[model samples]
Target chain A: IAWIALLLLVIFYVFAVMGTKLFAQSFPEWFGTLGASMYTLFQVMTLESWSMGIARPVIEAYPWAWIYFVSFILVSSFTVLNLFIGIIIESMQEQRAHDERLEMLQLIRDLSSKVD
Target chain B: IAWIALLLLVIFYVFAVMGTKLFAQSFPEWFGTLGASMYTLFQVMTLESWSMGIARPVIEAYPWAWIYFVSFILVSSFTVLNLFIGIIIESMQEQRAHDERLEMLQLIRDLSSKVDRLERR
Candidate 1:
């Protein structure tokens, strides 16, 4: 599950790097280099002042830039959240089944001991 | 659970505001005001560009500012992650109990129907 989450993050990072690299000249502080772009995109994913701090200014220069930022946030955040939820649910199911098997084994043992 | 999370968040926000207000003069861009500080703290908790974007520069000036930022990150992030885990565990336990209750109800229904059939015969 962690591997899957990491893979998804790396995939999103690639998209973020490519998109931000295209606008590097306009958003020097955030998109000047691949590393800076990744950092800024991480900030955006956290939704901390992303609009006022970063996206809005960039959108002012390129009006449709909102599409890029918004989509990245939606996709990345949703996927990561689902990744956590999925793992939790999967583990819960496994634990429930394990408990049931233990109960069944206990019942079987009780019956065999009574027969003896 | 959600109320607890919200209360914790509010408490953290108060601390963030107070700390940032104290350091506003030194870190004008991040801790300039209560709102900016909250935003910056939120970024830090998320472990985003916090070190490079905000804390590192502040540390460059104050040197010991690392302790403040690092501790804030550790405390706030750990608390928030625990909040999430607690909720998930609580809900899972509730769901398991609910399922058990449902199974008991089905068993009772089956036994009652069997008793009714036996009485009719």
Candidate 2:
């Protein structure tokens, strides 16, 4: 069931990222940032959280800092949250598969020792 | 191929972010907003777009809010688009690799099933 959700989320992301033209015209600012926000979110998940802080100086200097900050909050909390859940599901599946394989190998060894 | 694309995207993002500093001196306001925009973009992408509205109060507080909003749109559209395409491709490749390994296991299961059927015959 969780895997199903992951697959669905991935499908959604693929479509969301590709269907830029559809959304771009209506809200180009949004569509573009939607893609970027996903990528940045991945970076943060992968240990690039510093990048967020690094960007703060720029926001401070800009007159329009409010817009970027607001957009960030909107996109990250709503859209990116689902995305993160999907990725975490993927990661957990991968981990479980690895452990299963290891368990199988151990079982094989035990059976062989008893037979010998 | 997609990995290369991801690599390129990373490079571009780095250069893009660094370049903002250059633009900062020229358009300090723009450069600042650009950095914030990218950072916010990441947060939205990772989670669910919840972060997009989360930062609204901060945005509304100042007259420069429009400037930041516009910069996020502009930079994210032109520069970040290709990078996302690249990432999707990489993800597909990774998924395929996983499927291929599973295919091997399925084949082994089929072979064992065939052997058991032969013994019964």
Candidate 3:
């Protein structure tokens, strides 16, 4: 499990760095780095209104100008997110099953070894 | 400390699985895996305004479409959230203490033991 988490962390880090570097150039309007990264991520994910949640009401009160562009961002971003989830979930399921089997075996041994 | 963090991580995994697998699908259309997952977690923890917080302007523009959904989500999610933080704090304290203790003990033991032996000689 630790290894799996470590692997995912590495994978996430790689893509995160790559995406930040690449997208920062293409989408300078959004990619303000650490300061604006949260909003950037929400935009990448095409999650509607994330800025509205975090932004001052005055900022949000302006027209919903960015929502249309979000659809294009979704095409690429969700693909990456889904791919990441697929790999992690595949490994995670195996890890869970292995853990469960080991746990069951241990329970059986503990039961048998107990004094009458 | 490491052990406590590991234990807490395990505990969180168990509850999260139980909550997701058993209850997630039963919830309303509002529950897309990611959105719903976040929502369910928030509801379980009882966070408020998560839906209106996320919807289309027209959808959200309506007065409190599912503001209540989020409150429940927040309630449920926050309880579980606290468990995570509690365990993290506990484990972190131990990790910090053990590390500092080891560093201090090594320095004191090495310097004092050397001095004591030399004095005895």
Candidate 4:
């Protein structure tokens, strides 16, 4: 969880800087400042109003700008989100195995006396 | 999963019927029909615009109607949703143990080879 969280933060920070640098001049409201781009990028991560509100409008101005957000969406939603869920499921399985292994030891102990 | 799913369905049906009966006349748009109340109740579960859009409006006409939605929210979110997570966690544990148990058997089989050499004489 911590690793994935740190990764997501890095992604967000990296994108915010690039977004501010790329789109700040033309789309001031969404990417005017570093903080502004961070918040807007977070909104894009959620996909709440990314397309109709921000993406399409920006894409109209800079035709190739689609690559930036398309990459962001795929990296965050597909890779990061996918990794988070996978980690959680594996963690749950290992936790459960600990409990079951302890129980199995108790069973083996009970039968050990009669094994001879 | 199926058990909790069936339970949620029953709860939704019961609440939808009662909601239409209670608020249909007062708040016609939200609770005009049984189906309308179901969609409105689903919207409320999502916590989208339920408070400003539906609850406060209905609460104005019938001040005591809070109990209806309060019960629904707790039963669905707190009880039903909680059970679902618990079930998944338990199921995952049992699944991993199966894999571990198979590996344990191979260790036992390897040890059995040494134990039989003396018995053969």
Tell me, by lDDT, which candidate is best.
4
lDDT against true structure, model 4: 0.72
Q: Which is the leading candidate under DockQ?
A: 1
Work out the TM-score per prediction.
0.49, 0.23, 0.27, 0.45
**Residue range B5-118, candidate 4, lDDT tens digits:** 777888889888888989889887678886457656765654545656678788989877777877878887865556556555555566666676775565445445545543
Across residues A1-116, which tens digit of lDDT does each residue of candidate 1 receive? 57668878786677777766677888878898878788888777767767667865787787567568667775787678668777887777768875774565555445434421
- What digit string (tens of lDDT, one per residue) describes model 3 on residues A1-116? 24445554454344445435644554445544534544555443444443333222212332232332233344444355445545655555555655654555555445434422
Better of 1 and 3 by DockQ: 1
Which segments of model 1 are wrong by more than 4 Å? A1-79, A90-116, B94-121
> B14-120, model 2: which lDDT tens digit per residue?
64465354444544433455554354444433333313342343344443444544454455454455655444444544564466457656655655666665666
lDDT (tens digit, per residue) of candidate 3 on B1-121 = 2444465445444444543454345433333344334433332232223444433321343334344343444544555456545544553344654554565556556556666656767
DockQ for each numbered candidate: 0.07, 0.03, 0.04, 0.06
For every candidate, what is the interface RMSD in angstroms?
Answer: 11.2, 15.4, 18.9, 11.0
Q: Poorest 10 consecutive residues of model 2 chain B by lDDT?
A: B46-55
**lDDT of model 4 at position A96:** 75
Candidate 4 lDDT by residue in tens digits, A6-65: 778888999888889889999989999977898898888876657556865787798577
Please identify which of the two predictions, 2 or 3, would achieve the higher DockQ against the true structure: 3
- If both were scored by lDDT, which would come out higher, candidate 1 or candidate 2? 1
lDDT of 2 at B80: 50
Evaluated at residue A5, the lDDT of candidate 2 is 55
Best by TM-score: 1
**Model 1, span B1-121: residue lDDT tens:** 4766886778678768765766788886678776557656755665656787777888888776778888887778777677777767765675775675566555556556666656767
